[PDB]
Amino acid sequence: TEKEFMQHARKAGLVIPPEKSDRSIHLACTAGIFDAYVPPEGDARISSLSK
Amino acid sequence: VKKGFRAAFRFQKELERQRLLRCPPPPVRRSEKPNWDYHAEIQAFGHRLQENFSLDLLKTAFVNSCYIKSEEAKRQQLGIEKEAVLLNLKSNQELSEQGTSFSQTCLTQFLEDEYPDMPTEGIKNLVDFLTGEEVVCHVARNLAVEQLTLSEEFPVPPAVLQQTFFAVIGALLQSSGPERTALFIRDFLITQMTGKELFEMWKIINPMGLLVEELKKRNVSAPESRLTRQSGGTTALPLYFVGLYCDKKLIAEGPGETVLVAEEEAARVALRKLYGFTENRRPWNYSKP
Amino acid sequence: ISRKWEKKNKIVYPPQLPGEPRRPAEIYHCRRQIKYSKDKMWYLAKLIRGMSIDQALAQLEFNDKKGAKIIKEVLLEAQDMAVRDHNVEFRSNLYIAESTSGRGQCLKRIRYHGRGRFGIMEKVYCHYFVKLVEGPPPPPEPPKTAVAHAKEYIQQLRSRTIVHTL
Amino acid sequence: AAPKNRRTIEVNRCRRRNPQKLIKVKNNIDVCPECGHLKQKHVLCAYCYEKVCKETAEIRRQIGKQEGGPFKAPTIETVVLYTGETPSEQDQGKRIIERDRKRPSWFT
Amino acid sequence: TARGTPSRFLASVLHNGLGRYVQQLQRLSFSVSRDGASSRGAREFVEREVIDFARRNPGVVIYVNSRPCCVPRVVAEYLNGAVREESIHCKSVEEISTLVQKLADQSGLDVIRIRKPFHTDNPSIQGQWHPFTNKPTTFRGLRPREVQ
Amino acid sequence: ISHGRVFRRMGLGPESRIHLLRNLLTGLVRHERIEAPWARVDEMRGYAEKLIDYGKLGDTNERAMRMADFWLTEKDLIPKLFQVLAPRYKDQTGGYTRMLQIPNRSLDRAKMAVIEYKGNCLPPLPLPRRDSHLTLLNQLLQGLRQDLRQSQ
Amino acid sequence: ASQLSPTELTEMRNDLFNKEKARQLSLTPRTEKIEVKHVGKTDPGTVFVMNKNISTPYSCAMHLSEWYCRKSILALVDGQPWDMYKPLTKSCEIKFLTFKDCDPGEVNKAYWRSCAMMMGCVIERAFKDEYMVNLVRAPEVPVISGAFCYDVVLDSKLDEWMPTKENLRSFTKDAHALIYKDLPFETLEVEAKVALEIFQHSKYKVDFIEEKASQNPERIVKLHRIGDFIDVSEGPLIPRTSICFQYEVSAVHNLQPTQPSLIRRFQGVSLPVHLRAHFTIWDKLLERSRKMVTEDQ
Amino acid sequence: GKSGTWWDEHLSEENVPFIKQLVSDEDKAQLASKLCPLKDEPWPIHPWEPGSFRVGLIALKLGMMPLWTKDGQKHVVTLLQVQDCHVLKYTSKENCNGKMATLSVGGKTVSRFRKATSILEFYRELGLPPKQ
Ligand SMILES: [Mg+2]
């Protein structure tokens, strides 16, 4: 008559591999884009071959 | 763990039993189950009916036009040319037409010389019942032509089942004379009339008008309806007895819960007594002449 | 332990044909390990059973039980999940179709009775289940009138046969 | 006294599910004319009562700030005033408690 | 027990005896093990008697699957659609022949309680009994204690 | 058998009942609005009305002084009772101690209520308003009243 | 104007009504978004996103709660009363009204217009088909007066009788049968040309359409429909016909000498479900309704 | 569904004293209308036969009081007051038991706002305020 529950867990992953190790994560992409291509304002007006 | 193998296997088979029982699968054609061979099934269908079919005409009878069009669409969506065999599939249309025409004329001849008093409308309704969709679908399902039917939509919607059943009737008409096909349609359609009252097939609406027209044909003047016996007129479960007297002479007697339903039932009883289709009639003489 | 109510939100039906009915929405939700008995929770789950969601929230905001606030929070988060994710557009257009409660995992304690004797106190826990279906609440089945009873009795008197012969 | 036989689940379901023990549906609930927060008839709306109890707690806080310690209990009536709202000529001898807020549009 | 099992009424499947009689069995699916002491009787049966049984009644189709299996079985499917599967694990030749003959004889209706073993379809001929049979009529249909 | 038996039994005796009502009445005179359970505020309203009557009796009267000395246990509320509340109610006779239910206590689910002396510089309670005169039933009855007064 | 069975007339009227409704519904090609806002008292800052010419204000209430579905009778589209089953047109602001509000006079006028239309619906289908009845109009009487009115001319054979209590009891039973079916007041904004093309026969109705089409510049009339009944009324109505609980038609009166033929003024009284009265107060209000109410000037 | 309701739920503040005054004057006029029964249309008055039974009343127990007799003893009396008593309906002999006819008698007056519908219809056809 002396027993309690188990399984105290959490549902939020974190930044554990920099808490310390000698293996870094090999990514395969980047964050976003380098410098945005701003389109011309009248590209629909310039929808033909050239102008 | 309890060591061993046979109990765990037996429980696994029982789990597969309950798991297949909870969610039953969509049923598949018998031609797509492992134990199947079409030619031997055609020969066994020919031999079990004590008939001598020519197998080419039975194979002609069991194809359908929807099967031909779906097979051609399947051969064209893949691009494989099947112009070798599919141009001689020769669907069962003309055999089905010969079958329905011959079965109609022979059933009308049977029911005409069996019943001399039946009007043409009544024998027309009877042959339309016996060659109708329901009972030929029943006979077709219990004579395994649905397993031999080549079509789409595996439940085989009953119009095309009727098509194949009259097709194999026409195949018997081609392969053997009118006597053999007459014996076949006797043995597998006239037996479906057993135990059924006449107005369970004809389904007339106003019987008293039909009775007074029939008695005007027989030159007996007018059926006047007298109440004969009743037991309980004020309760909620009455019982009446109406007798139809033509010229102070009884012709019928009908019971019912009210006088209208009992008079209409006496009209039905008089109509069956006049037409020679009663429960006391001669049962059909299934024999060999 | 078995969690099957939570997986019922991840069913996906094939897309309907135009000549078909609407197939109204179904939303399953539950809250596990409630510090409450299962029978007192069952009385509230029977109170709710058939009513619409707004009438259920009304009857639970004024019911003086510990389970009432818990079921009101569960119903509010189920309504919010129904409006956001499960493609229900009218918030009041929901009725409870299934609502029940099951026994959860328990613990055990001593009672220290009035000699060198004792009992086994159990710290009870329970679950709550709920299922919402969009559309109006279906009407209650009316009590069958005298003509229905007379029709059933006359039909039973019609259906009898000559027994134990031919 | 002891049980002689164990009650079944049929007798138990016949006991604990009859209409004498079930929770009865009530129909006294309507909406409040202000703020619509589902009041009951014959009972003050909980939201509006929470409003006036919060403002009463604030006014009592300022009153306790004005009365030093315990046992003062002034011998003149009181009035409260919001921002702006100069003391009218009837409210001369009355004690003035001004917090800092607009006068809300239900306290007149 | 009869209350714990379903029941049917006695009936023929498609009115056999009126017109022509037809063999109600379609297929017989034999699975015999190549090696194995459990299927020695079925092995000898497939050697010596199944050809004479197939020539005995040509309506039935017989398949011999010849598959490695610990329990040999025979699968019988009837005309109306029922499927009855029975095992021939460790039986003689005579018992297997009697089993397949009994499978060939019966019709595909379920082996349950038969429930009033006769099926007259016109049970009455002179007219079924109603309470006004054997009760005479009286003049002008007067009930008892009637005035006119 | 309690036919015609007023004064429900509150505390652990009669004396603790009167001490409980004394503390509630002292809190009412001090704070001018009180929330407490329903039977207690019913008894305390019934006592508070006649306490206001004894305050209306006057300051120099020694009997009212003895009653105010007994019932107010903070001794600063006696100048308040004789110089604020009783001059405020000089025109009215007994219409005060307005009592209304507030829904339920959170912990033990007891029936709570709120009483207040009238006057009361605190913000007002959301009182239950009678239905307006411009609605359908009231306008039909107003037509009936005008039509009958014209007919008379 | 032609010979007509009484059934095929309401058949062609309802078929023309459904044709005009299908035209109005097919006028918009797609689902365009309008931003209706709530400047009511209870839930401020609420903004719905609705389908143009599709979404009723009942469908704007169905986002909020069920109490808005039960107790909102008449809505307010930026200045004006809108009945609960009329599709919105422009991006606007909305606010609901109930019976127990402070100034409910607009919903009182709408309720008595609804009850007059129900009295027209019950009066056109109880008379003998050999006899002729023509719905004249519904006079907008102020609600302080003892009853709502509807004017109907009868056949020339009917210039001498007056109905007993039993005929009015049959009228009330048919009206309660109309209440028993939970029917919607389905409204429609129809151009005056096709509006008069619907009726085309009853000259009083044509004169009423020309009257109410004369005052507005765009020749737009307000039609409403209760099942297969069709009538013209000024302004909005109540959403459902089950909102009425107590309903009773009081009596009829003859006001002859203004015209050679005879007009008959049918009178009745009602109250909703939300404001039902006790039986004594109700029979008092019923007893006042038997007197003649005259407010047309 | 339908909520509960009572007579003065939806009245305004001005209409309640008018409604109370109206129904009080109405049923006081109703009670004063039946004050002359012999000139209205009375049923035929019969003389006393030796085997007859008359109707009773319905009274109200006010209290008790002493009362002395001429020979000196003390008796105690109970004061029964008949406030408003009216015969309500007459059921004939063949309609109740076939033995003796019945007469219904009503007690003290009550409010119309707290009785059932069928009782209110019955008293409205009779023309009296309802009895307790
Ligand atoms: Mg106590």
Ligand SMILES: [Zn+2]
């Ligand atoms: Zn509120």
